[PDB]
Specification:
part of a larger assembly; 2 chains; B: mainly beta; 2 helices; Trafficking protein particle complex II-specific subunit 65 (chain B)
């Protein structure tokens, strides 16, 4: 047998406009039992996944049936932006959920943060945070 | 057996949990050393508290108490510092450490050094308004936040349904004095008069068919806790249920 040492390592409804969020959560026992933060993350805006999905899917405009986007976009029916913090509660974590460029049949952003201050450990205990939101559409042409 | 210590924890449910330790002078120990102190011509003790610290008991952790503290020394007294916990959801009783350092004193020397640490669990443990029929939960999206100044304002009754016939009901305010130990008659009359006459609800039988705005104007002052009157009514016989929630100072 060969072991080694055990290491010491809200459903918002935004109506097609800008918004905000705030996250200060004490699910951060991943280095020395939730002492403090490694380094900050001052209000990271999440709208870039659905920007670079909702732009080129309707800028496909090649033959759309052969699916050069060949993998299924069932995991792109949410957003799941990420904030992997560097080497108590969550110090700074805000996100401007801007629905002003968004689809009409999506639900959430399962936002996963790699909580560890673990220098190249390949170990980082990533805890995910959901939203389970709903969109009330205001206008169509 | 020189300074009796106790920790009291109060559960503020709309915030963090608050727990305060409390030092005291332990009189059944003070008359002991008072006898030998007035034998050596001294009236009261001079115990010096030089390092007082509460640490979050874990594998290893520590906290910091929620105001400032110097390095103090008192004769026959009691002190009590407060440190904020984190309000747990269910079933995790946290523990703390609470170390201290009493330094006794004598004639400019002979400071008999003492130290103490009593580690224990910091769990004393003694706004959604549900429909109570079919989980049609209501919550104001800005409850208990309103400093109006006898101006108009708008609120947000975010109704959360079963999404099964979601268009059913109507709000109203009932500006009528309810018809009710003689000063127990008068306090109930002043409560029922200031409830039913102080605010107006400019959208009266608004007939909501899942947000709302509900503009009020509010023509008298005073802290209106719990905002009574603002009833709803639904498709069945009498779902006359309250909101029971939200408050507004009007000055």
């Amino acid at each position: 047998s060969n072991p080694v040492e055990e290491e010491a390592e809200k459903m918002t409804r935004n109506s097609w406009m800008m918004l905000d969020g705030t996250k200060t959560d004490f699910h951060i026992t991943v280095r020395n039992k939730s002492l403090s933060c490694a380094i900050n993350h001052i209000k990271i805006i999440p709208m870039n996944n659905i920007e670079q999905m909702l732009k080129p899917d309707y800028w496909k405009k090649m033959p759309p049936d052969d699916l050069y986007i060949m993998e299924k976009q069932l995991d792109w029916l949410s957003k799941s932006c990420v904030r992997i913090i560097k080497l108590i509660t969550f110090d700074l974590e805000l996100d401007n959920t801007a629905v002003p460029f968004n689809f009409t049949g999506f639900d959430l952003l399962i936002e996963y943060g790699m909580s560890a201050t673990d220098e190249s450990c390949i170990y980082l205990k990533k805890l995910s945070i959901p939203y389970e939101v709903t969109l009330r559409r205001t206008i169509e042409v | 057996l020189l300074n009796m210590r106790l920790r009291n924890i109060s559960l503020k449910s709309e915030h963090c949990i608050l727990s305060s330790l409390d030092f005291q002078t332990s009189k059944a120990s003070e008359q002991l050393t008072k006898k030998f102190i007035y034998p050596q011509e001294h009236n009261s003790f001079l115990k010096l508290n030089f390092q007082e610290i509460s640490y979050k008991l874990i594998d290893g952790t520590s906290q910091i108490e929620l105001d400032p503290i110097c390095p103090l020394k008192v004769p026959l007294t009691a002190f009590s510092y407060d440190s904020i916990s984190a309000t747990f959801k269910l079933v995790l009783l946290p523990k703390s450490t609470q170390p201290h350092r009493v330094k006794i004193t004598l004639a400019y020397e002979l400071e008999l050094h003492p130290n103490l640490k009593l580690p224990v669990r910091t769990s004393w443990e003694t706004s959604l308004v549900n429909s109570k029929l079919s989980n049609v939960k209501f919550k104001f999206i800005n409850s208990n936040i309103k400093v109006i100044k006898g101006e108009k304002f708008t609120m947000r009754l975010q109704i959360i349904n079963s999404s099964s016939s979601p268009l059913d009901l109507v709000v109203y305010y009932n500006n009528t004095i309810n018809p009710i130990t003689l000063e127990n008659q008068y306090q109930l009359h002043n409560k029922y008069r200031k409830i039913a006459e102080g605010i107006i609800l400019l959208s009266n039988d608004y007939k909501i068919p899942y947000f709302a705005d509900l503009r009020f104007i509010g023509i008298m002052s005073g802290y209106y806790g719990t905002l009574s009157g603002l009833k709803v009514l639904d498709l069945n016989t009498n779902e006359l249920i309250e909101v029971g929630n939200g408050a507004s100072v009007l000055i």
